[PDB]
Amino acid sequence: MEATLEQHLEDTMKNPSIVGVLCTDSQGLNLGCRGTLSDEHAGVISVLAQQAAKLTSDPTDIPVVCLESDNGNIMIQKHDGITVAVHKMA
C-alpha cells in the first residue's frame, strides 16, 4: 500500500455493491477500468461530466452526476482532477 491508482480500482471493487469503476481526466481517455466499464464509456462519461459542470454557475460546486436506472445507478464526479465513474447497486 504505497497507494497506487490500480490499488483503488481493485480496492473499491472489494464491495459486492460496486460493480465496475472507471477513471478519466477530461479527454475521453481510459486510465484504467474494472467491472462493467470499458473504453467505449471513457468518452461519454467525460462529456456528461464536462457539460454538467456548465450548470455550475461558478465552480467548487462539484456536481456528482448521479444516474439512476434498472441495471444500477451511476455516480459521476469530477474529482481530484480526474473524473471518476462508480457503478453501484441501490
Partner: protein, 93 residues
C-alpha cells in the same frame, strides 16, 4: 389524533425552487429560478442528449430512468418521456 396519526407528522419533503419543461428543444413551461433563461434550457438539452446516448451494451438502447445531478445545496432531477424533458430543482436534505 393518535400516536399513529396527524400528531405524528410525516416525513417532510425538501422545498421546490425551480421547475422546467422543454419539448422539441423548446421551453414549454418554466417557473421558479428556471425563469426564461436559456442557460439550463440549452445546457441540459445536450446533457440530456448526451446522457441519453450512453447505451452501456448490457442493458441496451435505454440509458436511464432518471438523471440526478447533485450539488452542495440544491439538486436537479431530470426526466424524459418521448423527447419531453422534465427538470425539478429542489433542495437537498
Amino acid at each position: 389524533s393518535m400516536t399513529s396519526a396527524l400528531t405524528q407528522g410525516l416525513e417532510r419533503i425538501p422545498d421546490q425552487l425551480g421547475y422546467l419543461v422543454l419539448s422539441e428543444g423548446a421551453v414549454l413551461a418554466s417557473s421558479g429560478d428556471l425563469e426564461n433563461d436559456e442557460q439550463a434550457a440549452s445546457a441540459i438539452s445536450e446533457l440530456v442528449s448526451t446522457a441519453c446516448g450512453f447505451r452501456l451494451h448490457r442493458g441496451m438502447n435505454v440509458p436511464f430512468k432518471r438523471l440526478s445531478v447533485v450539488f452542495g445545496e440544491h439538486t436537479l432531477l431530470v426526466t424524459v418521456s418521448g423527447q419531453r424533458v422534465f427538470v425539478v430543482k429542489r433542495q437537498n436534505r
